Amino acid sequence: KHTGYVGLKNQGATCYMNSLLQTLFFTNQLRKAVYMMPTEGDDSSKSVPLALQRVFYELQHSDKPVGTKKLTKSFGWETLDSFMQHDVQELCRVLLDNVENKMKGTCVEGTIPKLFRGKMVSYIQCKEVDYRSDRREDYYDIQLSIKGKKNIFESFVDYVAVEQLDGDNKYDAGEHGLQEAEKGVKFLTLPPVLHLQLMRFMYDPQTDQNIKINDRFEFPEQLPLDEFLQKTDPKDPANYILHAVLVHSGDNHGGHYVVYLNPKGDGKWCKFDDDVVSRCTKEEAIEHNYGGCTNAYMLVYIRESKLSEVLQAVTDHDIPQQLVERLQEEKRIEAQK
Ligand X SMILES: C[C@H](CC(=O)N1CCC(O)(Cn2cnc3cc(NC(=O)CCN4CCN(C)CC4)ccc3c2=O)CC1)c1ccccc1
Active centre residues (catalytic): 15, 256
Q: Does 87 bind ligand X (CB under 6 A)?
A: yes
Task: For residue 272, list its beta bridge partners.
Answer: 259, 277
Of 304, 300, 220, nearest to 25 by C-alpha is: 300
Query: Which of 121, 185, 199, 229 is in the footprint of ligand X by CB under 6 A?
Result: 199
Residue 44, contacted partner among a second copy, ligand X, none, CB below 5-8 A by kind: none
Q: Out of 212, 282, 288, 331, point to the residue binding ligand X (CB under 6 A).
A: 212
Residue 312 binding a second copy, by CB under 8 A: yes
297 contact choice in a second copy, ligand X, none (CB below 5 to 8 Å, kind-dependent):
ligand X
Q: How does DSSP assign 180-244, residue by residue?
A: -EEEEEEES---SEEEEEE--EEEETTTTEEEE-----B--SEEE-GGGBSS--TTS--EEEEEE
End-to-end Cα separation, the chain, in angstroms: 25
311 CB burial (10 A radius; 0-12, 13-18, 19+): buried
Instruction: List the single partner that 230 binds among ligand X, a second copy, none, CB under 5 to 8 Å by kind.
Output: none
109 part of the interface to a second copy, by CB under 8 A: yes
Task: Say how many residues touch ligand X, by CB under 6 A.
Answer: 15
315 binds a second copy (CB under 8 A): yes
Cβ 115 vs Cβ 30: under 8 Å: yes
Nearest-CA neighbor of 81 among 8, 15, 10, 9? Answer: 15
98 binds, among a second copy, ligand X, none (CB under 5 to 8 A by kind): none
Mask for 117-146, x = binds ligand X (CB under 6 A): --------------------------x---
Which of 219, 190, 183 lies closest to 296 in space, CA to CA?
219
Residue nearer to a second copy on the CB measure, 196 or 311: 311
Backbone φ, ψ for residue 207 (5° rounding) = -85, 0
Quick one: what does residue 15 bind among ligand X, a second copy, none, with the CB cut-off 5 to 8 Å set by partner type? Answer: ligand X
How far is residue 99's CA from residue 28's CA, in Å, rounded to a whole number? Answer: 15
Please work out the total of residues on this chain that contact a second copy, with binding judged by CB under 8 A: 16
108, interface contact from ligand X, a second copy, none, CB < 5-8 Å by kind: a second copy
Q: Which is nearer to a second copy, 33 or 299 (CB)?
A: 33
Could you tell which of ligand X, a second copy, none binds residue 278, using a CB distance below 5 to 8 A set by kind?
none
Cβ–Cβ < 8 Å for 299, 244: yes
Residue from the set 85, 106, 249, 328 that interacts with a second copy by CB under 8 A? 106
Q: Which residues contact 329 (CB under 8 A, 6 or more apart)?
A: none
- Cα separation, 308 vs 298, whole angstroms: 22
- Candidate segments 54-62, 94-102, 108-116, 122-130, binder of a second copy by CB under 8 A: 108-116
Residue closer to a second copy (CB basis): 110 or 224:
110
Quick one: which of 248, 240, 215 has its CA closest to 300?
240
Report the alpha-carbon distance of residue 329 to residue 337 in Å, rounded: 13
The residue from 3, 9, 38, 275 that contacts a second copy (CB under 8 A) is 38
Q: Which residue lies nearer to ligand X by CB, 134 or 251? A: 251
> Do residues 198 and 218 lie in contact, with contact meaning Cβ atoms separated by under 8 Å?
no
> Binding to a second copy by residue 335, rule CB under 8 A?
no
CA 134 to chain centre: 27
Closest approach of Cβ 146 to ligand X, in Å? 9
Residues that bind a second copy (CB under 8 A): 36, 38, 106-110, 114, 308-309, 312-313, 315, 317, 320-321
Site residues for ligand X per CB under 6 A: 15-16, 87-89, 143, 197, 199-201, 212, 248, 252-253, 297
